[PDB]
Scaffold this active site. Sequence first.
Site, PDB file in Angstrom:
ATOM      1  N   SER A 168       0.815  -1.214   0.000  1.00  0.00           N
ATOM      2  CA  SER A 168       0.000   0.000   0.000  1.00  0.00           C
ATOM      3  C   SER A 168       0.852   1.269   0.000  1.00  0.00           C
ATOM      4  O   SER A 168       1.933   1.319   0.595  1.00  0.00           O
ATOM      5  CB  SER A 168      -0.899   0.026   1.240  1.00  0.00           C
ATOM      6  OG  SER A 168      -1.877  -0.983   1.171  1.00  0.00           O
ATOM      7  N   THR A 218      -6.573   3.412   7.049  1.00  0.00           N
ATOM      8  CA  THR A 218      -7.992   3.270   7.368  1.00  0.00           C
ATOM      9  C   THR A 218      -8.288   3.336   8.862  1.00  0.00           C
ATOM     10  O   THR A 218      -9.448   3.150   9.251  1.00  0.00           O
ATOM     11  CB  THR A 218      -8.549   1.957   6.800  1.00  0.00           C
ATOM     12  OG1 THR A 218      -7.813   0.856   7.333  1.00  0.00           O
ATOM     13  CG2 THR A 218      -8.444   1.930   5.290  1.00  0.00           C
ATOM     14  N   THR A 252       6.528 -13.616   8.493  1.00  0.00           N
ATOM     15  CA  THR A 252       6.429 -12.941   9.789  1.00  0.00           C
ATOM     16  C   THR A 252       4.976 -12.933  10.253  1.00  0.00           C
ATOM     17  O   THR A 252       4.397 -11.866  10.474  1.00  0.00           O
ATOM     18  CB  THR A 252       6.955 -11.503   9.705  1.00  0.00           C
ATOM     19  OG1 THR A 252       6.161 -10.776   8.757  1.00  0.00           O
ATOM     20  CG2 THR A 252       8.407 -11.459   9.258  1.00  0.00           C
ATOM     21  N   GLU A 254      -2.276 -15.349  12.757  1.00  0.00           N
ATOM     22  CA  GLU A 254      -2.021 -15.864  11.414  1.00  0.00           C
ATOM     23  C   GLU A 254      -1.225 -17.162  11.417  1.00  0.00           C
ATOM     24  O   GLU A 254      -1.465 -18.012  10.556  1.00  0.00           O
ATOM     25  CB  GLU A 254      -1.403 -14.763  10.509  1.00  0.00           C
ATOM     26  CG  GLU A 254      -1.932 -13.339  10.863  1.00  0.00           C
ATOM     27  CD  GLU A 254      -1.089 -12.122  10.444  1.00  0.00           C
ATOM     28  OE1 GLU A 254       0.168 -12.135  10.531  1.00  0.00           O
ATOM     29  OE2 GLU A 254      -1.734 -11.120  10.036  1.00  0.00           O
ATOM     30  N   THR A 284       5.198 -13.210  16.073  1.00  0.00           N
ATOM     31  CA  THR A 284       5.035 -12.236  17.146  1.00  0.00           C
ATOM     32  C   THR A 284       3.729 -12.502  17.883  1.00  0.00           C
ATOM     33  O   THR A 284       2.717 -12.846  17.264  1.00  0.00           O
ATOM     34  CB  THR A 284       5.035 -10.798  16.617  1.00  0.00           C
ATOM     35  OG1 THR A 284       4.117 -10.709  15.521  1.00  0.00           O
ATOM     36  CG2 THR A 284       6.428 -10.429  16.125  1.00  0.00           C
ATOM     37  N   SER A 285       3.749 -12.329  19.202  1.00  0.00           N
ATOM     38  CA  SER A 285       2.597 -12.682  20.021  1.00  0.00           C
ATOM     39  C   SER A 285       2.527 -11.772  21.240  1.00  0.00           C
ATOM     40  O   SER A 285       3.530 -11.582  21.933  1.00  0.00           O
ATOM     41  CB  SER A 285       2.677 -14.153  20.466  1.00  0.00           C
ATOM     42  OG  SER A 285       1.835 -14.387  21.594  1.00  0.00           O
ATOM     43  N   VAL A 340       6.092  -0.393  24.137  1.00  0.00           N
ATOM     44  CA  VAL A 340       5.842   1.011  24.446  1.00  0.00           C
ATOM     45  C   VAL A 340       4.338   1.220  24.611  1.00  0.00           C
ATOM     46  O   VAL A 340       3.517   0.435  24.124  1.00  0.00           O
ATOM     47  CB  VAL A 340       6.441   1.949  23.382  1.00  0.00           C
ATOM     48  CG1 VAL A 340       7.893   1.547  23.056  1.00  0.00           C
ATOM     49  CG2 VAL A 340       5.601   1.938  22.136  1.00  0.00           C
ATOM     50  N   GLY A 391       3.939  -3.837  11.731  1.00  0.00           N
ATOM     51  CA  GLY A 391       4.280  -5.098  11.087  1.00  0.00           C
ATOM     52  C   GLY A 391       4.940  -4.914   9.737  1.00  0.00           C
ATOM     53  O   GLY A 391       5.796  -5.721   9.349  1.00  0.00           O
ATOM     54  N   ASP A 392       4.550  -3.861   9.005  1.00  0.00           N
ATOM     55  CA  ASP A 392       5.218  -3.511   7.749  1.00  0.00           C
ATOM     56  C   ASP A 392       6.675  -3.122   7.993  1.00  0.00           C
ATOM     57  O   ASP A 392       7.573  -3.569   7.276  1.00  0.00           O
ATOM     58  CB  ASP A 392       4.486  -2.350   7.047  1.00  0.00           C
ATOM     59  CG  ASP A 392       2.981  -2.606   6.844  1.00  0.00           C
ATOM     60  OD1 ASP A 392       2.615  -3.738   6.477  1.00  0.00           O
ATOM     61  OD2 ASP A 392       2.183  -1.645   7.011  1.00  0.00           O
TER      62      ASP A 392
HETATM   63  O1  LU2 Z   1       9.913  -4.920  17.964  1.00  0.00           O
HETATM   64  C1  LU2 Z   1       8.723  -4.836  17.879  1.00  0.00           C
HETATM   65  C2  LU2 Z   1       7.930  -5.643  16.775  1.00  0.00           C
HETATM   66  C3  LU2 Z   1       6.458  -5.464  16.803  1.00  0.00           C
HETATM   67  C4  LU2 Z   1       5.506  -6.073  15.808  1.00  0.00           C
HETATM   68  C5  LU2 Z   1       5.950  -6.967  14.856  1.00  0.00           C
HETATM   69  C6  LU2 Z   1       5.043  -7.510  13.969  1.00  0.00           C
HETATM   70  C7  LU2 Z   1       3.709  -7.142  14.047  1.00  0.00           C
HETATM   71  O2  LU2 Z   1       2.794  -7.674  13.144  1.00  0.00           O
HETATM   72  C8  LU2 Z   1       3.274  -6.242  15.005  1.00  0.00           C
HETATM   73  O3  LU2 Z   1       1.924  -5.882  15.068  1.00  0.00           O
HETATM   74  C9  LU2 Z   1       4.178  -5.706  15.895  1.00  0.00           C
HETATM   75  O4  LU2 Z   1       5.878  -4.602  17.835  1.00  0.00           O
HETATM   76  C10 LU2 Z   1       6.511  -3.878  18.751  1.00  0.00           C
HETATM   77  C11 LU2 Z   1       5.882  -2.972  19.759  1.00  0.00           C
HETATM   78  C12 LU2 Z   1       6.715  -2.382  20.527  1.00  0.00           C
HETATM   79  O5  LU2 Z   1       6.062  -1.546  21.437  1.00  0.00           O
HETATM   80  C13 LU2 Z   1       7.910  -2.419  20.601  1.00  0.00           C
HETATM   81  C14 LU2 Z   1       8.487  -3.187  19.769  1.00  0.00           C
HETATM   82  O6  LU2 Z   1       9.889  -3.223  19.880  1.00  0.00           O
HETATM   83  C15 LU2 Z   1       7.940  -4.025  18.739  1.00  0.00           C
HETATM   84 NA    NA Z   2       3.744  -9.452  11.705  1.00  0.00          NA
END
Ligand code: LU2
Ligand code: NA
EC number: 2.7.1.35
Lengths: 309, 307
Positions: A9, A44, A145, A150, A183-184, A223, A231-232
């Site tokens: 996008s 959006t 990723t 997912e 990521t979780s 944070v 995620g991008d």
């Molecule tokens: O390294 C970080 C990576 C991500 C993250 C990675 C993939 C996702 O699809 C997503 O939704 C978040 O989220 C964070 C959120 C944080 O507050 C700090 C971080 O360091 C990360």
């Molecule tokens: Na992701």
Amino acid sequence: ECRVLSIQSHVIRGYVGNRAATFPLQVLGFEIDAVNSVQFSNHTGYAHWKGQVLNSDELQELYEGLRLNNMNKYDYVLTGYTRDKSFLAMVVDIVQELKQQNPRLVYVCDPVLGDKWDGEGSMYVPEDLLPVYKEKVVPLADIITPNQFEAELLSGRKIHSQEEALRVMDMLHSMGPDTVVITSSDLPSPQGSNYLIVLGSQRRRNPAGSVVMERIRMDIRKVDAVFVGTGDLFAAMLLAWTHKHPNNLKVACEKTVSTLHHVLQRTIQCAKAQAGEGVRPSPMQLELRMVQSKRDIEDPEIVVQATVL
Amino acid sequence: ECRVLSIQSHVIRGYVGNRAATFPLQVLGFEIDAVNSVQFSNHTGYAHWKGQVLNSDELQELYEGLRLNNMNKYDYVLTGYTRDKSFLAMVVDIVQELKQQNPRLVYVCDPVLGDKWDGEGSMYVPEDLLPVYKEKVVPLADIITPNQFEAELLSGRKIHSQEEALRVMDMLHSMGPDTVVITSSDLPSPQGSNYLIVLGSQRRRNGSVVMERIRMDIRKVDAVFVGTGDLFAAMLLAWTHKHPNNLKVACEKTVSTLHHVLQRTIQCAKAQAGEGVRPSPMQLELRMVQSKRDIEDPEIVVQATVL
Ligand SMILES: O=c1cc(-c2ccc(O)c(O)c2)oc2cc(O)cc(O)c12
Ligand code: NA
Ligand SMILES: OC[C@H]1O[C@H](O[C@H]2O[C@H](CO)[C@@H](O)[C@H](O)[C@H]2O)[C@H](O)[C@@H](O)[C@@H]1O
Ligand SMILES: OC[C@H]1O[C@H](O[C@H]2O[C@H](CO)[C@@H](O)[C@H](O)[C@H]2O)[C@H](O)[C@@H](O)[C@@H]1O
Ligand SMILES: O=c1cc(-c2ccc(O)c(O)c2)oc2cc(O)cc(O)c12
Ligand code: NA
């Protein structure tokens, strides 16, 4: 020298999709080419948005322009949020072509499907994308990723623990990609309650010829806000740092996660200053402070060490 | 902080339009928002190209999204090559409204019309664009970057000398823009046949109306580059922003940036092509990404003289 085709996008205001991925990869020296799969005024999550969508016939036309000029030689393909099944299928066809042109091409896929909010998992894209991701996209991908939701959808299995997540990553490896990063926010952390868990697994053939697998875990104190485009940026930086550290998933993931932490920390401090004490910042105020994070993109101070699994 | 709305072409491969302007302005710390007026596989100097054009209704739709979110507060607008008259008319309407939102907004316009090849002028856009530029675009613009041929078309006079060019720049000033830079010319240089003249003129307040006029003689590297005018306008925007009362320094940094980029590009192109071989358009794409450190802080390689 290192060419990335990123099909994502575009927004006018803000940083999601190709706007989140392009500047950091350019700052890191990649020749990244951006195919804008939509052009919207903003993402959006705002009260309002307008824009235009690229359709699969137009995507095929643009690739044809590249092919005719013998410009279909890429080192990487990068994809993320994809809305339309016909479009995703054309992306598959292009990646197959590009992998025949260059069998060493690395396809980095963020298999965007949905997420969970407080127990409800729900999708962001048409459900008919999931069989395309399962049978056509993931088998072609080399790095994926997924978030936990997912990873569950792609594997057919619910994840309740690190144990089961590692089994799902093995399942994902067997579907195609040699690098799987989940990521979780729902897996438990011994460090507290607002922690994000990153699990990474990478299979490779070492100089001696043996197939080995490196597995890592990170426990990240989030944070204190949620952002759009995270995620991008994550997948783009994972591309960059696995490229620089191809046999060291631990270092690759530490630099990726540290870049994201610096960007998001800067973003929330700027957003709160604009919003005021106690005021919840707006989506406009929460746009990733991408251009102000150039130095952290270039050389991120490592702020969380991965543990070995 | 400093927000720029740039309405220019996008290509997938290469650096023209928004592809030439965006990364350098981001590197310099501008919040640049890119409206892609086309999306093509590459620029039209290649044997083939495919893509889609943004139409004026779609441009208006995009701007409406910004306005509905109260996101139509910009410090600069930046435009360049436009083929379509209704599209250019929409741009004017948008710039008009952004100036109502912010009276201090600076509109930087590269009025792309054509160029001279062996003194002979040839045009890049349809004829009906010229009246739009003369009567709607230039009067709204605050900084314009015509080449000599474009300065002649906008003003209606031929330029045969420095003095004539400066008089034409004064006519452009009276049409609107406080800063006018003629970015290439057929004018002679005492430094040799392989040089071109760049001339700049800026009207400003000191609180009286004062004028700064500058000249530079630049050794023209020998190759057909695409996107040079787009990069020039973007960096003139950047360095006049950093040095608002010093056209001399702003132009030295702009031209020096272009020098470093083009020098790196021709060294790479000649290495890929081989000794003797004229390089291809793909080999001549601006080495933008590899020039990051020159963009950040260009070593000055050319001095402007104040006239
Ligand atoms: O390294 C970080 C990576 C991500 C993250 C990675 C993939 C996702 O699809 C997503 O939704 C978040 O989220 C964070 C959120 C944080 O507050 C700090 C971080 O360091 C990360
Ligand atoms: Na992701
Ligand atoms: O490959 C081209 C350049 O890449 C490196 O520099 C970039 O990537 C670094 C991290 O790998 C960043 O720290 C740096 O800011 C980028 O410019 C390499 O170090 C350079 O010498 C190359 O020119
Ligand atoms: O206003 C934001 C930043 O702008 C400057 O830094 C950028 O611009 C410089 C030239 O003016 C470059 O040398 C530098 O690399 C850019 O990052 C300013 O110096 C910074 O303090 C601001 O953060
Ligand atoms: O500063 C330079 C500025 C440009 C330039 C600027 C605008 C145009 O519309 C154009 O067609 C060329 O041309 C150059 C060509 C050079 O070889 C070296 C340079 O430094 C420049
Ligand atoms: Na020009």
